[PDB]
Each structure stands twice: as C-alpha cells, then as structure tokens.
Amino acid sequence: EIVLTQSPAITAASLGQKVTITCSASSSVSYMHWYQQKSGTSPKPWIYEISKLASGVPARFSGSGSGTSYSLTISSMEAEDAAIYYCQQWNYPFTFGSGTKLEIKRADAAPTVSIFPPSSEQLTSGGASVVCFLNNFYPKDINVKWKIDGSERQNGVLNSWTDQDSKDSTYSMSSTLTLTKDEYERHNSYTCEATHKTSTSPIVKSFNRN
Amino acid sequence: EVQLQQSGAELARPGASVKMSCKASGYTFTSYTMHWVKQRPGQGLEWIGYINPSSGYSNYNQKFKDKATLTADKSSSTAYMQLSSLTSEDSAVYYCSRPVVRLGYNFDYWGQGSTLTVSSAKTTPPSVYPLAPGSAAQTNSMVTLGCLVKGYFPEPVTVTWNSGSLSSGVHTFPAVLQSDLYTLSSSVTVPSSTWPSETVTCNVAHPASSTKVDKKIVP
C-alpha cells in the first residue's frame, strides 16, 4: 500500500556543498529510517527513527521530517559520501524507498583515448576484436564512433562504462568491435572517435592492419 | 560479534528452484526474527518476508507469495529461503537481515549477499587476450596497457595486475552479457619508462570454474 518515493533520483554535489535529499510517503508514517549503500556491498544502517545517527556515521549527517515528508542532509559533502541512499518505513511491511544516487561534481576533463589491434593469439583462433579505451573524463556523457575504412558502423560494438573513480572522480568507457579474422582482413583502416563536451573536435585514434 | 554467513552464488535453469542459506552466530537464534531482501539492478531493495525461528511462522510480502518459502533450523541455527518457478526476472542478489529492537525494528545486521543467476547456459572458462598498443611510433610519458577477458560464464571474474602490486591506474569494466557468455576488459596506465623494461601481467580468476590465468603484456 504505502509507497516511498525519493527525490532527486540522481544528483552530483561538489565537495563542501550542503546536500539535502527527501522522501515522500503515500500516507503518514510515524518514523523513517535511512540506509547508505555502495556498489558491491551490503547496505548499511545510517539513520534510525528520523534523526538518530547510527554507529560510525559522521556528524555532518542529519535527518528530519514527519508524517509524509522526510529528509536527509549532509552539511559539507565529502568524497566518501558518494553512494545510494534508501529510506525505509519504520514498521511492517518495512517497505524501502526508490533510492537516490549521490555523486561527486568535479572539474571537466577530456578522455585519454587508446586503440588496440586484435591480439595474435585471438587471430590464431580465428577471431578479431578491436578494443578502445576512453579513460578518465568528466562529465559522464560521452559518445564513441567507429569507422572501418572511413565508414561508420552502426554496432557490432559492445560498450561498457565504469562508475565514478574513487581516486580522481572520473569516468571511463570501453568499446569493443568484434569481427572474424576474415572481416578484419577484409579492410585495413580502423578508427575510434570520442565526442565529449570538452571539445567539438572528436578525439580520433586509428591503426592500419597493414 | 553477531554474524550472518550466507551461502555461495547460484546458477539454475529457468523454471527450476533453489534454496539459499544463512548461518547465524553470536546470539540466541530463536530470540530474533530473520528477514530477506531482494536486489535487482534498476529496482534495488525489496522486502521479501521474515520467519520466526521458534514458532516457525513465516509472513511474506504479498508480491512474493507462492514464490518464496522461508524455513529455519534451530539445531543448526540456519535460515533457508527457497525460490521456485524461476524466471530471468529473479536473477539478483538476495540478502538476509536480523533486526535490533529499539523503538521498532532496526536492521543492523546484514549478510554479505548471494547472487543468483537464472539461466540454462553452461559454465565456460574465459579466454584472456593481451592488449598492447599498435605497432609503430606512438609514445608519451604514460603508457596504457589492457587485457581482454572474453567468453566466460557465469559471473564474476577478478582481474589484477602483478598480483595486486599495481593499483594506482587500474580500470576494470563491468561485464556485458550477450546470451550465454560474458565479456569484459581492464586497462592499466603506468609510466612509459616502466615498460617493457619491467614485467606487466594481468591475473584473471574465475572461481565458478577454478580458472586462474596470467597474461604477460609483451610488445
């Protein structure tokens, strides 16, 4: 019955900023709980009964609200605070909130592109996958483009992005064009282009099979 | 020291069933209840239900009725969660949590998690391929090397460089599924004067099939 809708769905805050996320219940509830979760780990209890901090939780955190609207606030946002926050109905059936993904707002950076030709061993097995890494950039929005002998190929490429790097707060993308030894040897010019808001000129990287 | 040790990852055919476990320790098993939570990417955290160890009574979330089935074994202090009539929609991570009673339930203890994969695909060892920069002239202060792990199943796989020694510039990408095989990549940026003068090797491990591979990045 009761639905907990958290907002914003996703937001990036700069180190030092005062962050405040909210939770809206469909009908009144006496108390609300808050949990913090990071990729690949069990969610951790963060706040009990609206405003009571859990063990190990930094004083910069605080909670408030009543009835149908509750809120979680971080006085001074810091690197370690980036994670997903969920709210929870204090009582049965213990429904969870929709969640809020809090990210870090950093300075802009251009992607260090690098292209790689099919490995000898893969070719020996009759396969040929061309890989290209678009590493360490920000914002997260970017677009790769492949050109075989000058012609754009609309897929046959697997894309994969990493989440925000814990050390320098950047993002990274992987692109892989998979072909057979024949298709690979059917052409010669292979190009990987990356378009990011850091420049209008797509960073190009290419190699020739011969 | 209150602990909850959950069972390992599971892989079962669509339409089959599965039974996970959670071994409790450091407290009186029968004095508290045990809850279960489901975690799917894009819809994280759903409450499944809870069991009363002593009475054996189980109360479920309407949504998971005739799907989930909780049981408990006093004698071995273990709680079992059984799922039946599986679909790819049930592939996710299943947690178990024991609450602390204050003004109400406080979920202070959670298990490490168990990832279930609903698929009839057969386990396949990964083909590790090295990624060295294209031949000819191209040199800078930094050099990025890589590794291509292709055609493995199921997840997960671990990739390291020089047995954990190198870390500062590592980048492992989240594997993408296609049908019955996974594929991922990993890159590492080190100083150019460090290669090929020094050895650089990726260490790929795949527990699901006891696979341990090492690929030296030769020019």
Add this chain to the structure above:
Amino acid sequence: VHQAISPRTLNAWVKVVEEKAFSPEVIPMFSALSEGATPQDLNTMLNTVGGHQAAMQMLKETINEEAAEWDRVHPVHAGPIAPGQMREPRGSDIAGTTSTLQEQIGWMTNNPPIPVGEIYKRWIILGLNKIVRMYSPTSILDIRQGPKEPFRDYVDRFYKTLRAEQASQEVKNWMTETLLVQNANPDCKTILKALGPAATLEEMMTACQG
C-alpha cells in the same frame, strides 16, 4: 398448619451437592428445592452440606455481609419500649440465627408481610454465585492488559493462566502468538502492530518496556 422441610427433600439436596459439587447447575436445583422454605429450613439444608468447608466459609461471611447491609437500610427502632404488635426483623433474625420458627412464620403471615424466608434465600444465592466463581476454570480470554500495567507483568499473568489450560497444542499456539497481542492495551498494541505478525516474544517485550 406448619409443615417443616421433608427428610426426602433434604436428602435429595445431599445427593445433589454430592454429585453436582458446585457447578453452575446447582443453583437452579437449590432454588427449586428451597421453594417456600422458612429461614430455619434453609439453614437445615446448608448445615446438611458435609465437607467443602472452604466454600462454606465464603457462604457464611457473605450472609454476614448482606445481613449487616440490611440493618443500615432498616434501622426501624432499636429497643421497642412500650409493646405494640410485633418487633421488626433484624439481619440476624432473617438469617434465622436469632429468631424462633414461630417468629419467622409470623413475619411471613402478617400485614404487610415480610418474606424473610425469601430474603435470606436471595442472600444464600449470592453466596452460592461467589462460590461457583472460585470453582470455575480460569479462562485466558479474560486476561487483558491494564492501561498502566507494564507489558512484562501482563506476559507473566498471561502465561501463568496458559499453563493451566485444557486445549490442544494447536489452539495454544494461536493464544501465544495472536491473542497475547490482541488483549494488550492500545499503546503497546500499537507498537506490537509495528513489528508484524511474526515478531518473537522477546522482541515484543523489549519493544514494550516503556
């Protein structure tokens, strides 16, 4: 003409108390048997009851209570100086403790009539009701929690009665789980409902210890 209580009638009474003991069904019997009897006759029946001294102690004091009460609402005239017709019946007189068979019969047939025989009877009935009560089995369905009663105290009582109950293990289950919660006072009940239908006893107590 005076007709005292028949030895047959008095003998049946013996067998009744002998068999029915003190079940709620005895009272109707007592009434039917003691119809129209004099305060003296009633006393005969009562004294005819052997054993059960415990129940008798109650009946006795109950009589004394009602008798004392009678004196308050009927203080007529203590010490009738200058004779007139007939002295007014005091409590002890109705009970037959201080009244001759003649006086009793007199009061019953006088204008206006004072049905002392019936009055005493009523008192005996009240006494019998009390006796049946202390002999009736303890129903757990009546064990509620007082608005100021500590939850732990309520539990102790609830379980005590439970230990003295004739029911199948299955029914006992329902009592332990659901019923215990059902009879809790509004506040504790509100907290127990927050834990859900499967909370453990220990958990409930820890939740309602305030």
